Amino acid sequence: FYIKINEDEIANDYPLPSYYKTSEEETDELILYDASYEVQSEHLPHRMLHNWALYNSDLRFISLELLPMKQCDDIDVNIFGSGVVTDDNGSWISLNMCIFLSQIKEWMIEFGSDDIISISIRTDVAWYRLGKPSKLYAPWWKPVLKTARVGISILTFLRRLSFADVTKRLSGLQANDKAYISSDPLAVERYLVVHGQIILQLFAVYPDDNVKRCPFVVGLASKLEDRHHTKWIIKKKKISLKELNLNPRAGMAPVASKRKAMQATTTRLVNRIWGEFYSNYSEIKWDGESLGKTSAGEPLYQQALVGGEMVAVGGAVTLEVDDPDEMPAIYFVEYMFESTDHCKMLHGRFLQRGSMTVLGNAANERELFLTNECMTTQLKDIKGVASFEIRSRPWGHQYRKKNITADKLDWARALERKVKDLPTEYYCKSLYSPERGGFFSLPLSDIGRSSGFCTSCKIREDEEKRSTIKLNVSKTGFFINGIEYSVEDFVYVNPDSIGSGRNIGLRAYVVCQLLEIVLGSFDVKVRRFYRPEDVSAEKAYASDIQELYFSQDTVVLPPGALEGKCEVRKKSDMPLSREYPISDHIFFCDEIRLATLDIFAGCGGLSHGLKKAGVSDAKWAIEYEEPAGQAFKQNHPESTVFVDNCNVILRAIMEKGGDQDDCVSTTEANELAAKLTEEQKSTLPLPGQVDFINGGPPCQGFSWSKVQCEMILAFLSFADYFRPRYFLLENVRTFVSFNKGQTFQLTLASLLEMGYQVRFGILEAGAYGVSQSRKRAFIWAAAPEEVLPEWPEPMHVFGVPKLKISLSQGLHYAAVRSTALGAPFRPITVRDTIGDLPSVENGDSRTNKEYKEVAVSWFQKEIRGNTIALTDHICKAMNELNLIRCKLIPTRPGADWHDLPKRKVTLSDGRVEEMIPFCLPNTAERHNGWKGLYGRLDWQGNFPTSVTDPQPMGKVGMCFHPEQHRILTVRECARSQGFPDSYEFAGNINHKHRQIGNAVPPPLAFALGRKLKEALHLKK
Ligand SMILES: Nc1ncnc2c1ncn2[C@@H]1O[C@H](CSCC[C@H](N)C(=O)O)[C@@H](O)[C@H]1O
Ligand SMILES: [Zn+2]
């Protein structure tokens, strides 16, 4: 009989589960060898194996101790392996063609000198001496050696004793020794009894016979019986080679891997900026006569002499503040007058330094920014004057060279002005606004008027007047938060003020009608409306998004419970344009289009939304992979899609433009560009024909030699070269936190240096109509003569706190308000998205089908439309074990692998495997019990983060249909993102899943495009 210890006992000494991966094809083991008649355990050939790796059927790394150390027939556990086979040669270990094996039968250890051990593996075909292991399998090999150490040392001590004495004598040795185990006797006893087979074989293999008869070995053999284990039998039968290879990867063609990255081709400006950053950081009198009088009669002047220095409107003065180590502040003066007290007042606006802004250390040293804050002081004492000027340059792609030629010269002067120890001359080009989070354009007509009227002061006074509730003269309305409320209006009330499962139980705005009025010493009495969700979930599922019900409930509230105004219309006259997502606060009860250029196009969700908005038409495109380019061509036939690498399309464009000296490129880029034919070269766009550039580079990760392949430098170079009237950048939420946010600051600095007005924001798509949580970072950029678009207003309640970008000096900016408190419309659940699709079986492959059930939900109605050809309703396939595991998970929400019963299942192939997929170590740092794996969804919940590859092998997460025992299909994943049912995808299932995963929800792009159209309609 043989005693085999279960993996749970030794799991405490082994790391967390990890799965085997490879990229090179292998050959079957049985092919190489003859597989002759039955022979003894010695006649098999002896060879060595390097780079070994052992795993179970699930391709999960397993320990060597799971293999019996003697000959047994009814082996209940099957372990497979891989490596490289070489001719045998004597090589020991003391202290420091690819081939996958068949089922592994046994392992044997032999002892040599005082510190010489050897291990070998026997299969049904031949022996294999053991060598160096793989880098991934190293952690699973350390304990096996460690226990061996525990043996070796104690042997040197045996040269007639009880069992506890050796334990207490071992518990006292210091932790610095290589044989240290633990000081607690219980721990040393447990470890000694849990790895008893290895040291038992070591004792039984020793040349000396006296050690074999020590009571230690028999006592340990007796005590091995108590705990969890299994029992086998021992026999010396002749092994038969008649078998077939049963490796899980008998087929399993290698997955594409090692997609190499190369240096990006850029222009001079962007490369210069990023490289420069990363190389170093990784007697007072008046002048003239009076010009007028203020509102109170104070005469105003325009010029003064202070200590010999000249002060005038448009200059800059310096004050004094505490902490003298800090530099003094700068104030741009607006007007200076004389008061009734025969004193000289002045009014100034603070000019912030770049280093205190969002840019941080990436900001320009000589660039100051106008601020909203302003103050008045006395002209009597001012540290001094400072050189200052407002910079304004013409816009266009034809001035670019000129705009460059001056800059160096300017910088040259600065360098000289730093060499000669002269005061630095500052400048201001834009207006920094942290309260809006952006660098807007200077209102040149409203600054330095010397009239006694200050625009910023009036704005602050109006804002102070705002939020102060005051009654109206007619006693029928009031003014609160800038809103003029009156009788017979419709108002929003917070749900609390009225007496995954992230959004479960979340309510929305309560719509009420003002009844009457009962500083601020009054209250409001209003009526009550009801929502379909207030009845049942079924009623809310099959009802319009804007439906409402009437009730006669009247209630009185303080004026602070109102959030805005809404409109209620009869069910006979609507705007007649069912736009989606909705942007108009309306309920019911009863010639500007610009030529664009899409970079990193993908499938084209963003381009689809922008075109649907009406401000874009995809006249050109750039992609990398064939299936994505084919899909983009299919969906947008009029676009001229370029499939060749983008990093060389820029080189081709520059070469066509005759400025090859202003484009740094690799040697391969020139050869690739020269290989293009004549039609594609003639189709390339030229500067001046592009008025919109959008796209998102794939820069995700956590130094100059590495950040030169981020793929965003090429995007910045494209924007610099073409100089469109508008620019859009999109990336992941964590884009503003890579390398402590250095890349985001650098992108902002480059955009400012080119000359745009930029603004940034983190937007959650779930509040705009989609049913999937997805947060993205967006950057808008506009020309100085245009108007930067405003951020769209979310309309759906979704539970997520305010997503704030961290400014400098403890400041946060939130682009949009958090919609968890309330919103006009309810969120979208799982059943509202993919409920109507017909059921499919596991591993379906029919691309074209026919719809079976009519649309019920508002989302289904708005996303189906009139198409009658179901496309890409296919899902991946599971093997026997995975399908059986899937079938055992209940349909309740929140289910995971914790509900899988503990047992072993024999497959039809002829293998026995454990049902439990993982063996986590007890008393370890396994967060939340590894929940979420093998998990179903919820009908009323929301979709989790979309994975680019939901894989049915190994560690499979929450990607299961709530009812059917399968994985979600391609069409369901597309629908969860808001993609219209008429959209087309190309490639195999993996490529389509990757295409859908990387796509941006079309509704968000439509909202951004609508805001851009509103901005464009206002330039006049
Ligand atoms: N060097 C490169 N040149 C061109 N395309 C690239 C690229 N590296 C990645 N891509 C492609 O750019 C895309 C990144 S995700 C962009 C998705 C797109 N904005 C949408 O809304 O659908 C992927 O399709 C990726 O394959
Ligand atoms: Zn002012």
Coordinates of C-alpha atoms in Angstrom, one line a residue, residues 6-199:
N6 CA -3.9 15.4 -0.8
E7 CA -3.0 18.8 -2.3
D8 CA -5.0 20.8 0.3
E9 CA -2.6 19.8 3.1
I10 CA 0.4 21.1 1.2
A11 CA -1.4 24.1 -0.4
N12 CA -0.2 26.3 2.5
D13 CA 3.4 26.0 1.3
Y14 CA 2.8 26.6 -2.4
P15 CA 1.9 29.9 -4.3
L16 CA -1.4 30.9 -5.8
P17 CA -2.6 29.0 -8.9
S18 CA -1.2 29.9 -12.3
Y19 CA -1.6 28.4 -15.7
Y20 CA 0.8 27.2 -18.4
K21 CA 1.3 29.2 -21.6
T22 CA 3.5 28.7 -24.6
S23 CA 3.9 29.9 -28.2
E24 CA 5.8 27.1 -29.9
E25 CA 4.3 24.0 -31.4
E26 CA 5.3 20.6 -30.0
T27 CA 5.5 17.0 -31.2
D28 CA 3.8 13.9 -29.7
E29 CA 6.0 11.8 -27.4
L30 CA 4.8 8.4 -28.8
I31 CA 6.0 9.2 -32.3
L32 CA 9.7 9.3 -31.4
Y33 CA 9.9 6.0 -29.6
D34 CA 9.1 2.5 -30.9
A35 CA 6.6 1.5 -28.2
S36 CA 7.7 -2.1 -28.3
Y37 CA 6.4 -5.1 -26.3
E38 CA 6.3 -5.2 -22.5
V39 CA 9.6 -4.7 -20.8
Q40 CA 10.7 -4.3 -17.2
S41 CA 11.1 -1.0 -15.3
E42 CA 14.8 -0.9 -16.1
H43 CA 14.9 -1.7 -19.9
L44 CA 13.4 1.7 -20.8
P45 CA 15.8 4.3 -22.3
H46 CA 17.4 7.0 -20.2
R47 CA 17.4 10.6 -21.4
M48 CA 17.4 14.0 -19.8
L49 CA 14.7 16.7 -20.0
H50 CA 15.3 20.5 -19.7
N51 CA 12.9 23.4 -19.2
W52 CA 10.3 21.1 -17.7
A53 CA 6.9 22.1 -16.7
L54 CA 4.2 20.0 -15.1
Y55 CA 0.4 20.7 -15.1
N56 CA -3.0 19.0 -14.8
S57 CA -5.7 18.8 -17.4
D58 CA -6.6 22.5 -16.9
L59 CA -3.0 23.5 -17.8
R60 CA -2.5 24.6 -14.1
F61 CA 0.9 24.1 -12.6
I62 CA 1.0 21.2 -10.1
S63 CA 3.6 20.0 -7.6
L64 CA 5.8 17.0 -7.9
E65 CA 4.7 15.6 -4.5
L66 CA 1.3 14.6 -6.1
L67 CA 3.1 11.8 -7.9
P68 CA 3.6 8.4 -6.2
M69 CA 7.1 7.6 -5.3
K70 CA 6.7 3.8 -6.0
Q71 CA 5.1 1.5 -8.5
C72 CA 1.3 1.6 -8.6
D73 CA -1.3 0.6 -11.2
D74 CA -4.6 2.3 -10.3
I75 CA -3.3 5.9 -10.5
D76 CA -6.2 8.2 -9.7
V77 CA -4.3 11.5 -10.6
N78 CA -3.0 12.3 -14.0
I79 CA -0.2 14.8 -14.5
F80 CA 1.2 15.9 -17.8
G81 CA 4.4 17.7 -18.7
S82 CA 6.5 19.5 -21.3
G83 CA 10.1 20.4 -22.0
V84 CA 13.0 19.5 -24.3
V85 CA 14.5 16.1 -24.6
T86 CA 18.3 15.6 -24.8
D87 CA 20.7 12.6 -24.5
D88 CA 21.4 11.5 -20.9
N89 CA 24.6 12.7 -19.3
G90 CA 25.7 12.7 -15.6
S91 CA 25.0 16.0 -13.9
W92 CA 24.2 16.5 -10.3
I93 CA 22.6 19.4 -8.3
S94 CA 23.8 20.4 -4.8
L95 CA 23.0 24.1 -4.3
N96 CA 22.7 27.0 -6.6
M97 CA 13.4 20.1 -29.6
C98 CA 10.2 20.9 -27.8
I99 CA 8.2 17.9 -26.6
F100 CA 5.1 17.5 -24.4
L101 CA 4.9 14.2 -22.4
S102 CA 2.1 11.7 -22.1
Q103 CA 0.6 10.7 -18.7
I104 CA 3.3 10.7 -16.0
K105 CA 3.4 7.5 -13.9
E106 CA 6.1 7.9 -11.2
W107 CA 9.0 9.9 -9.9
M108 CA 12.1 8.6 -8.2
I109 CA 14.8 10.3 -6.1
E110 CA 18.3 9.0 -5.4
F111 CA 21.0 10.2 -3.0
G112 CA 24.7 10.7 -3.7
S113 CA 27.3 12.4 -1.6
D114 CA 26.6 14.4 1.5
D115 CA 24.8 17.1 -0.5
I116 CA 24.1 15.3 -3.8
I117 CA 20.5 14.4 -4.8
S118 CA 18.9 13.5 -8.1
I119 CA 15.3 13.3 -9.3
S120 CA 13.8 11.5 -12.3
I121 CA 10.4 10.9 -13.9
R122 CA 9.1 7.7 -15.4
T123 CA 6.3 7.6 -17.9
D124 CA 5.0 4.5 -19.8
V125 CA 7.6 5.0 -22.5
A126 CA 10.9 6.0 -21.1
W127 CA 12.8 7.6 -18.2
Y128 CA 13.7 11.2 -18.0
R129 CA 16.4 12.7 -15.8
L130 CA 15.6 16.1 -14.4
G131 CA 17.4 19.4 -15.1
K132 CA 16.8 23.1 -14.9
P133 CA 13.1 24.1 -14.7
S134 CA 11.2 26.9 -16.4
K135 CA 11.1 30.4 -14.9
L136 CA 7.4 30.1 -14.3
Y137 CA 7.6 26.7 -12.6
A138 CA 10.4 27.7 -10.3
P139 CA 8.2 28.6 -7.3
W140 CA 6.7 25.1 -7.4
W141 CA 10.1 23.5 -7.2
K142 CA 11.5 25.3 -4.2
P143 CA 9.6 23.4 -1.5
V144 CA 10.6 20.0 -2.9
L145 CA 14.3 21.0 -2.5
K146 CA 13.5 22.5 0.9
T147 CA 12.2 19.3 2.4
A148 CA 15.2 17.6 1.0
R149 CA 17.4 20.0 2.9
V150 CA 15.4 19.1 6.0
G151 CA 16.3 15.5 5.4
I152 CA 20.0 16.0 4.7
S153 CA 20.7 18.0 7.9
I154 CA 18.9 15.5 10.2
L155 CA 20.9 12.7 8.7
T156 CA 24.1 14.4 9.8
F157 CA 22.5 14.5 13.3
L158 CA 21.7 10.8 13.4
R159 CA 25.4 9.9 13.3
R160 CA 17.4 5.2 19.8
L161 CA 15.4 8.5 20.0
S162 CA 11.8 9.4 20.4
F163 CA 9.7 11.6 18.0
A164 CA 9.3 14.8 19.9
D165 CA 12.9 15.2 20.8
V166 CA 14.1 15.9 17.2
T167 CA 11.2 18.3 16.8
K168 CA 12.2 20.4 19.8
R169 CA 15.9 20.3 18.9
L170 CA 15.1 21.5 15.4
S171 CA 12.7 24.2 16.7
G172 CA 15.6 26.0 18.4
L173 CA 17.9 26.7 15.4
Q174 CA 18.1 30.3 14.2
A175 CA 16.3 31.5 11.1
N176 CA 19.6 32.3 9.3
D177 CA 20.3 28.6 8.6
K178 CA 19.2 27.1 5.3
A179 CA 17.4 24.3 7.2
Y180 CA 15.2 26.7 9.3
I181 CA 11.6 25.7 9.3
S182 CA 9.7 27.2 12.4
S183 CA 10.1 27.8 16.1
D184 CA 6.7 26.5 17.1
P185 CA 6.7 22.7 17.8
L186 CA 3.2 22.3 16.3
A187 CA 4.3 23.9 13.0
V188 CA 7.5 21.8 12.8
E189 CA 5.5 18.6 13.6
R190 CA 2.8 19.4 10.9
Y191 CA 5.4 20.2 8.3
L192 CA 7.4 17.0 9.1
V193 CA 4.3 14.8 8.9
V194 CA 2.9 16.5 5.8
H195 CA 6.1 15.8 3.7
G196 CA 6.9 12.4 5.2
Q197 CA 7.2 10.5 2.0
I198 CA 10.3 12.4 0.7
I199 CA 12.4 12.0 3.8

